[PDB]
Amino acid sequence: GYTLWNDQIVKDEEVKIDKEDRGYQFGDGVYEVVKVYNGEMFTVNEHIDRLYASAEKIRITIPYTKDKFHQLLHELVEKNELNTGHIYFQVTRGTSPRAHQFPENTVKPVIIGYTKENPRPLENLEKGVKATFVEDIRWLRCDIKSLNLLGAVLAKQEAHEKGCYEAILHRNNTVTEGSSSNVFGIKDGILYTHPANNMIAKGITRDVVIACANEINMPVKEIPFTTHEALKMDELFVTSTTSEITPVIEIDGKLIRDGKVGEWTRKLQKQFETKIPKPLHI
Amino acid sequence: GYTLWNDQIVKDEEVKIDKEDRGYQFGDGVYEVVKVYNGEMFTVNEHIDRLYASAEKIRITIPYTKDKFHQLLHELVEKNELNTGHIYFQVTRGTSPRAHQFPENTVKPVIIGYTKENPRPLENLEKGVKATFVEDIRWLRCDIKSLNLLGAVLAKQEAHEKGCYEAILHRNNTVTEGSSSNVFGIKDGILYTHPANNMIAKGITRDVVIACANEINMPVKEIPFTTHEALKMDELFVTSTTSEITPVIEIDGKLIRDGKVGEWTRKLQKQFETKIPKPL
Ligand SMILES: Cc1ncc(COP(=O)(O)O)c(CN)c1O
Ligand SMILES: Cc1ncc(COP(=O)(O)O)c(CN)c1O
Numbered sequence: 001g002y003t004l005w006n007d008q009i010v011k012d013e014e015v016k017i018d019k020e021d022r023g024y025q026f027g028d029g030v031y032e033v034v035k036v037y038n039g040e041m042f043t044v045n046e047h048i049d050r051l052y053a054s055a056e057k058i059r060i061t062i063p064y065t066k067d068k069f070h071q072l073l074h075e076l077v078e079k080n081e082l083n084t085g086h087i088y089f090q091v092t093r094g095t096s097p098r099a100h101q102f103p104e105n106t107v108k109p110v111i112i113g114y115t116k117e118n119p120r121p122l123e124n125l126e127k128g129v130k131a132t133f134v135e136d137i138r139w140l141r142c143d144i145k146s147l148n149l150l151g152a153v154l155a156k157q158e159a160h161e162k163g164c165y166e167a168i169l170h171r172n173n174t175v176t177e178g179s180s181s182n183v184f185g186i187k188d189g190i191l192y193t194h195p196a197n198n199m200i201a202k203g204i205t206r207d208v209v210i211a212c213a214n215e216i217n218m219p220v221k222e223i224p225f226t227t228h229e230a231l232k233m234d235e236l237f238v239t240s241t242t243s244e245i246t247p248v249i250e251i252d253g254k255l256i257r258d259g260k261v262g263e264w265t266r267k268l269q270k271q272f273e274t275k276i277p278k279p280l281h282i
Numbered sequence: 283g284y285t286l287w288n289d290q291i292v293k294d295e296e297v298k299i300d301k302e303d304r305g306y307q308f309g310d311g312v313y314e315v316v317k318v319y320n321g322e323m324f325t326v327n328e329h330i331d332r333l334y335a336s337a338e339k340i341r342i343t344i345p346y347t348k349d350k351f352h353q354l355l356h357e358l359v360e361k362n363e364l365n366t367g368h369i370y371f372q373v374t375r376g377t378s379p380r381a382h383q384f385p386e387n388t389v390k391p392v393i394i395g396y397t398k399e400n401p402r403p404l405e406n407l408e409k410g411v412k413a414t415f416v417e418d419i420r421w422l423r424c425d426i427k428s429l430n431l432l433g434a435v436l437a438k439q440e441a442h443e444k445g446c447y448e449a450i451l452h453r454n455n456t457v458t459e460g461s462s463s464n465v466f467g468i469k470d471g472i473l474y475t476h477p478a479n480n481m482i483a484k485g486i487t488r489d490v491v492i493a494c495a496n497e498i499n500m501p502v503k504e505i506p507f508t509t510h511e512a513l514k515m516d517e518l519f520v521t522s523t524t525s526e527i528t529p530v531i532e533i534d535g536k537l538i539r540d541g542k543v544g545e546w547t548r549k550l551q552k553q554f555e556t557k558i559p560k561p562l
Contacts, residue, residue, distance in 0.1 A: 003301065017299035017306060019285065019394050024299055025372075026431040027309025058432065088380060090307070097398075098370060100431070100438035100462055112301050116379070139433055140419035148430035149308040149382070151421055154340065156382035180382055 002079045004089065004113030007064060009075050012114075021110055023092030026100070027147040029109075030054035031090035033241045034073070036082050036115070040277035042241075044073060046204045054145045055091055059102070060109055062091060073113065080115045086242060089113035090147065121243060125269065128247035128261050129165035131238070133227055134158050136169035136176050136199075143198045155179040166238050168251065171199060174224045178238050181246075182206040185225055186235035186264050195222040205239040212271040218264065235262030245269050284361045286354055286371065286395035289346065291361055294396070303392055305374030308382070309430040311391075312336035313372035316355070317523045318364050318397075322559035326352065328486045329523075333373070336427045341384070342375050342391055355395065362397045368524060371395030372429065403525065407551065410529035410543050411447035413520070415509050416440050418451035418458050425480050437461040448520050450533065453481065456506045460520045463528075464488040467507055468517035468546045477504040487521040494553040500546060517544030527551045 005015050022028035032051045035042045048066050055062055062069070073087055092110045096103035138151035156179040159167035166178045177183055177200040184206075185192045191213045196202040213220050230236060236248040236256045245268055247261040285297050304310035314329045314336075330348050337344050344351070355369060374392045378385035420433035438461040441449035448460045459465055459482040466488075467474040473495050478484040495502045512518060518530045518538045527550055529543040 012301075015301055017301060017303075019297055019299055019396070021299065021306070024303070024306045025313075025429060026435050027429055028432055028435055031307075058436065100435050101442040102435075102439050114301065137422040139421045139430075146432055147307065147309055148432045150310060150340065150428055150430045151423075153304075153308050153310055153382050153384075157384050160383040 001115065002076065004072055004076050004111065006108075006111050007068070007072065009072065009079050015112070017110070017112075018095040020098055021092055021095050023090065023110065023147055025098060027149070028058070029090050029092030029147045030058065030060065030145055031088070031147060032145065034087045034089075035241045036077055036085055036087060037277050038084055039077065039082065041073065041077065041087070042277060043204050043208065044070065046207070047241075048073075050145065050202075050204065051089070051091065057141075057144045058146065060091060060093055062111075063108060076113055076115060082115045083117060084119060085115060085117040087113060087115050092147070118242065121246065124165070124246045125244060126261075128249035130163065130250045131166050131168050131178070131248045132159050132162050132164045132252050134167040134169055134179075136171040138169075141198055142176070142200050143196070143202065145201050152179040165246070166243075166248070168230070168238075168248070170227050173226045173228075175227060175230050176200050176224075177203075178240075181238035181240035181243055183230075184209065184237050184239065185230055185233040186262060187233050189218065189264060191218055191220045191264070192225055192233075193220075193222055194224045203239060203241075205241055205244065208275065209239050209245060209268060209272065212268055212275070216267055216271050218268075231256070233257075235265050237265050245272055283397065284358065286358045286393065288390075288393050289350070289354060291354075291357055297394070299392075300377045302380055303374055303377050304385075305372065305392065305429055307380055309428060310340075311372050311374030311429045312340065312342065312427050313370065313429060314427065315523045316369045316371075318359060318368060319366055319559045320561055321359065321365055322561065323355065323359065323369070324523075324558060325486055325490065326355065328489075332427065332484075332486065333371070337373055339423075339426045340428065342373060344373055344391060344393075358395055358397060364397045364399060366402070367398045367400040369395060369397050374429070400524070403528065406447070406528050407526060408543070410531035410541075412445065412532045413448045413450045413460070413530045414441050414444050414446045414534050416449040416451055416461075418453045420451075423480055424458070424482050425478070425484060427483055434461040447528070448525075448530070450509075450512070450520070450530075452509050455508045455510070457509060457512055458482050458506075459485075460522075463520035463522035463525055465512075466491065466519050466521065467512050467515040468544060469515050471500060471546060473500055473502045473546070474507050474515075475502075475504055476506045485521060487523055487526065490557065491521055491527065491550060491554065494550055494557075498549055498553050500549070513538070515539075517547045519547050519550075527554050
C-alpha cells in the first residue's frame with residue numbers, strides 16, 4: 001500500500017530505514033495508534049496531542065504542526081482506502097552515527113505511518129476474555145509512549161502462551177495497566193483505575209471511558225488497587241484503541257464474580273458506542 | 283564501507299531496514315560492541331558468548347553457531363581494513379506484522395554489524411574524567427543487553443549537558459553502573475563494585491578488571507556502595523569496551539580524594555594493558 005514517510009505519502013517500496021536510525025538502535029522514539037471506523041478516524045486529535053506530548057517529554061522536536069500531521073493522516077487513510085482498522089505512526093530522533101547522547105540539533109526526526117484493516121473485536125466485546133497477572137518490571141517513565149516496549153513484549157507473550165488475551169501488570173502487588181491497555185475495576189457500582197502518573201500510559205480510551213462514566217452518572221475513583229482486590233471486583237475490563245472496552249472475566253483460572261460480563265461494563269459499552277463515528281441514515 | 287547483513291557482507295548502501303523490523307518498533311533485539319586493536323579483536327569469544335546469552339534471555343534463537351558468527355566478524359574487519367576501533371553488531375527477532383507477542387517461529391532474526399575506526403581515549407585514561415549522579419529509572423532487567431536504551435540515552439545526555447563524561451546511576455542512592463559502563467570504587471586498596479545481578483550489565487571489561495585485580499593480589503569485594511560512600515572513596519573509575527579503564531576524578535564538583543588518578547587505578551591500567559593486543 002502506501003506509507004507516510006516524513007511528510008510524504010509514498011509507496012511502501014520507496015521507504016528506506018537506515019541502520020543507525022536511533023529508533024532501531026536505542027528505541028529512541030514515540031508512537032501512537034488511531035482507530036478508523038468505516039473511513040473516519042476516532043479521536044485523532046487527542047492522539048496527535050499525545051504524540052507531541054510524548055515526543056516533547058524525551059526532547060524530540062516534530063518538524064511540523066499538528067494540522068500538517070492531521071492532513072497527512074487523512075491523506076494516508078484515503079490513499080490506502082482504509083475502511084475499518086487502524087493507523088500506526090511513530091517518530092524517532094533520526095539517523096546519526098551511534099552515540100548515546102542526542103545528536104546535533106541539525107538531525108531530522110524520522111516519521112513513519114501506515115494502516116492496517118482490522119475489524120472490531122466482536123467476540124471479545126461480547127464474551128469477555130481471560131487474563132493473567134505479570135510482574136511489572138518496566139522502567140519508571142511509563143507515562144511516555146516510547147519504542148522501548150520489550151517489557152510489554154515479554155508480558156504479552158507470557159499471557160499468549162497460557163491462552164490469555166492480556167497480561168495485567170502489577171508493581172509491588174499494585175495493578176498498574178496491561179501490556180497494551182489500561183485496567184479498570186468495578187465494585188458496588190463504582191469505577192476504579194490507577195491514576196495517570198509515571199506508572200502508566202494515560203490512554204485515550206481510558207479517558208473516553210471515564211468521560212462515559214461521568215455521563216451515565218457513575219462515580220469514578222482514580223485509586224490504585226492490588227492483585228488481591230482486583231480478584232474481588234464485581235467487574236473488570238481492559239481498554240485500548242484496538243480493544244475498546246474488553247471485559248475480563250477470569251484471571252489465572254479465577255472467575256471475576258460469576259465469569260459473565262457485568263451490567264456496568266455493558267452500560268459503559270453502550271455509552272462508548274454513541275461516540276463512535278457513524279453516518280445519520282445509512 | 284561494508285556491513286554484515288545476516289550472513290553476507292554487503293556495501294553499506296545496500297542495507298535496508300524494514301519498517302516492521304521488531305527492533306525498530308519494540309527495541310526487540312540485543313547487541314554487542316567489540317574493540318579491535320591493530321586488526322585484532324579483543325575478547326571476542328566473551329562478547330559472542332554474551333550476545334547468545336542475551337538473545338537466549340528474551341528467547342531469540344540465533345540461526346548461526348558461534349563459530350560461523352566468529353568467522354563472519356573476522357571477514358567484516360578484514361573487508362573494512364579496520365586497524366583500531368570497534369565492531370558494533372545486533373540481532374533483532376525479525377520482521378513481522380506489528381504485534382506484541384512473538385511471531386511465528388518461521389520468522390528469521392535480522393543481523394546487522396558494522397565497523398568504526400576509533401582511537402583509544404589516551405587523554406582520558408591519563409587525566410581522568412568528570413561524572414554526575416543520575417537516578418536510575420531503567421527497567422529491572424539490566425542484565426540483558428537489549429536495544430531498549432532510552433534510559434541510558436537520557437542519562438548520557440544529562441551528563442553530556444553538564445560537561446561530564448559519564449552519568450553514574452543509582453537506585454535509591456545505591457550506585458549501580460554508568461549509562462554505558464560499570465563503576466568501581468577503591469578504598470584502602472580494596473576494589474568495590476555492585477554485584478552482577480538483574481540491576482546491571484555484567485560488563486566484559488568489568489570481568490577483565492576483576493581478573494586483573496586477582497592477578498595483582500588486590501582484594502575484590504562485589505558489594506554495592508552508596509552515592510555518599512562513593513564520594514568518600516580513595517579512587518573511582520568506570521569501565522566499558524571503549525572506555526577501557528577510565529578514571530573519574532570529580533563527581534558533581536566534588537573531587538575524589540585529590541582529583542588525581544590514584545595508585546591502584548594505575549596498577550589496574552598496567553595489568554589491563556598486558557592483555558590488549560600490540561602486534562607489530
Ligand atoms: C502501555 C500501554 N497502555 C495503554 C495503552 C492503551 O492506550 P490507548 O487507549 O490510547 O490505546 C497502550 C496502547 N495500546 C499501551 O501501549
Ligand atoms: C549499561 C552498560 N553497562 C556496562 C557497559 C560496558 O561493558 P562492556 O565492557 O561489556 O562494554 C555497557 C556498554 N554497552 C552498558 O551499556
